[PDB]
DNA sequence: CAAGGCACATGACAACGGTGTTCAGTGCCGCGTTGCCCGATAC
DNA sequence: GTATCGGGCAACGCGGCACTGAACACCGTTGTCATGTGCCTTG
């Protein structure tokens, strides 16, 4: 995840930390794992780099029911939606043409110019149910 | 509009206020409008009664980009998704079995036990462009 | 270290954490320890509670070489000075009237009204020197 | 105050500015003084030249209450401690064998190998009261 | 001059300072002027707010021969060009349709998709010669 | 390309290197190209030669957005303004009496004594879109 | 004597990291008060 | 004796004041990258 600013070791460390992890992790916990791993970057830098990466579109952002935001470096750059587990944080990418066609169908039948669809699916894993 | 607690004029007034207004209103602006009406109900009471109504399912909730939660009552008790306009706030009840089938198919494919879908689409209103 | 305002759990947790340890620690290290202990207190509130305690005189504030302010709940409530080991963080309680008398002597000789001595003896332990 | 680097007019100007004034002044205020005097030297160069002098020992570094580090050129070459008035900024150098004796006694008693002591006393001078 | 961020006294002060001045001023010169006016905002926030205002398009950015950029608020919102006096910093709004027409003519004859025109005339102030 | 200094093969090689090239290159890139050719000329001498040529008037300079100044030998000695591409960088000499006449007209009607104007326009190259 | 040419230095802008404001929502003890039930009492 | 009604009393309600916490804004200090001196050497 390259950052559009001038190359520096804090950006490199944050990008590598996103690369290693594949789960939706908040800014605070991401800073916590950076702190305990040894890179030792600040928290406002984590905010700033994550926000810039989200603006550039390198990582996808999700809003949890609590009110915080969580980040993750998706494997595919194509537009997709996510299946997430609150108990584990695991996310898998899913794409469906049917929901897209429904979206523009509804937009056309209401006559709106352009629309933005936010579809998030939340579920519990079968392994999580097992104890 | 029955509530879990004992009926009172304050909760009756807030239920009526939700009845007339058909737009997403946050708790603060709802309280301001109610005070403008003249009932002068406490803000914390409005907060807790809105939370109770949302829990009971009579009122649907939506988390905006800023973070404040907006509340209004939907005429149809059946499950549906709401279309919203930022420039107007108009809300229309839209339902489609296709997204339900897509979500349940993904849940069956990935072995998740039970899932909940939160599908919200944001678009630009038709008359907003006209000026 | 009771707080002037209403007692609450987010402040009782901070007080308990301060009473638990003896080393100097900043608000952000203390916040991490509080979080990983299982209390989940916000950082701004940790900062505010430490500021209030230091204003009331319950805790002793100190600035490291780098300039970040650290705190500690000391056993003795009387006038005292601290011996610190930056490699280990243990603080030793030492008090001397000679430096006080020197302070009044210098103030009287140079005619100053009031005096505030900031005396701090940094050091390295014999055990620390051993490898 | 010779500077470790090659002789240049930027170093000469910063050294002359340090020599002219007798009050503890920060790097940001020293730069403004130089800018008004006609030097036209950049701020980063002032920062790094003051650091070079500080590690060279030719200047005495100090920290203000709010965290900014201030500097002053003291003519006395022997070890000494400073008495500074916050309202005026005027500083008078003082020295007392009592603090050295106490530091040596504490180091001997508690077994610390080597120590470093910081002793600064803050007070208001006579002219502050006069008005 | 509102800023895209939350309203604060630092942004208010920098906006008022830009409103008062009629000549081009850099970031460091404006910071010095605003420091001597007594508002005392930092230089970093001056940089950030000026870049935010330039991005919003409220102020005009001009690069001098030395390479530094100078900002000034222009009352006329319509696109125009500037005539400046490097001896004073004065600016007078000026516009010409012939240059713009030549711009699309040259772009079309060489088939460039879109173009941007940077025309800046540097002149000697009328009263500068008089002495 | 005569040089104000004594003729030597450093200046000869620099003049030749500017001779074959037709694209705008900064001094560091020109030095890298010359080193690749194997002449092994110092970078400070490269600067000195380029500023000497610019003062003499053989070459023309424009300043990039980042701040780098690029030198190029224009075939036409007459005063003209250059169109350059963001990526391709090809330069075409375009001149128009209209902009000049505008410049002296404004200088006269505002009474400016003498004016030094710079005209440079940026645009997206024709074949850049084609891929 | 002057140009060549290193090593090290410079200065406007970008980037960093400990602390501090915002502003929508939560916690708690002071009250009122609905609601029931027994006491009195009219019949 | 049977009867409705009033009042005591509890167990819930309201509700203003102080507190909270994730996100955004801050000021002093350090870093990046293209260009500029001090000083030694050779034509
Ligand atoms: Zn994604
Ligand atoms: Zn799971
Ligand atoms: Zn989609
Ligand atoms: Zn609904
Ligand atoms: Zn649905
Ligand atoms: Zn609309
Ligand atoms: Zn203590
Ligand atoms: Zn003492
Ligand atoms: Zn130790
Ligand atoms: Zn001194
Ligand atoms: Zn001493
Ligand atoms: Zn004084
Ligand atoms: Zn303008
Ligand atoms: Zn124009
Ligand atoms: Zn002028
Ligand atoms: Zn040319
Ligand atoms: Zn021209
Ligand atoms: Zn091109």
TrEMBL record, chains A, B, C, D, E, F:
One Pfam family cited in the UniProt record for this chain: FUR
Family in the record: Belongs to the Fur family.
Cofactor detail note: Binds 1 Mn(2+) or Fe(2+) ion per subunit. Binds 1 zinc ion per subunit.
Protein name: Zinc uptake regulation protein
Description of how the protein assembles with itself and partners: Homodimer.
UniProt subcellular location: Cytoplasm
Species this protein is from: Streptomyces coelicolor (strain ATCC BAA-471 / A3(2) / M145)
Residues that coordinate or bind Zn(2+): 85, 88, 125, 128
Cofactor: Mn(2+); Fe(2+); Zn(2+)
């Amino acid at each position: 995840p390259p950052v559009k600013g001038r190359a520096t070791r804090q950006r490199a460390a944050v990008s590598a930390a996103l690369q290693e992890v594949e789960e939706f992790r908040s800014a605070q916990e991401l800073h916590d794992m950076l702190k305990h791993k040894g890179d030792a970057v600040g928290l406002t830098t984590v905010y700033r780099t994550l926000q810039s990466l989200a603006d550039a579109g390198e990582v996808d952002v999700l809003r949890t029911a609590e009110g915080e935001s969580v980040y993750r470096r998706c494997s595919t750059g194509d537009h997709h939606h996510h299946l997430v587990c609150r108990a584990c944080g695991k996310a898998v990418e899913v794409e469906g043409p049917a929901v897209e066609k429904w979206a523009e169908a509804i937009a056309a039948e209401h006559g709106y110019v352009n629309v933005a669809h936010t579809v998030e699916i939340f579920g519990t894993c079968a392994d999580c149910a097992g104890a």
